[PDB]
Amino acid sequence: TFNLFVGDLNVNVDDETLRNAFKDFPSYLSGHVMWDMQTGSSRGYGFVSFTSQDDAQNAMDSMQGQDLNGRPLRINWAAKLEH
């Protein structure tokens, strides 16, 4: 699969909100907002999965810096979180 890291999420963005923003893009599979399992609070980022690399690439480019709940989406290829 081909996976996007979606950053700069408003802490009020839940799974439903994130999924609704990406649901209709070609090859979309799923979306999840990350939250701190010791507090329950959103980490302000999430992931969106696709069957196709080209389709994940286009969804990223289409949504890059677009506003969701007042905050610009900061999108990149999913990768190990640093530091």
Swiss-Prot record:
It comes from the Eukaryota. It is found in: Cytoplasm; Nucleus; Cytoplasm, P-body; Cytoplasm, Stress granule. Residues 2-80 form the RRM domain. May be associated with hnRNA within the nucleus and remains associated during nucleocytoplasmic mRNA transport, once the proteins are in the cytoplasm, disassembly of PUB1-RNA complexes may occur prior to PAB1 binding and formation of a translationally competent RNP complex. Binds to polyadenylated RNA; prefers to bind poly(rU); binds to T-rich single-stranded DNA. Interacts with NAB2. Present with 49600 molecules/cell in log phase SD medium. This is Nuclear and cytoplasmic polyadenylated RNA-binding protein PUB1. The gene is PUB1.
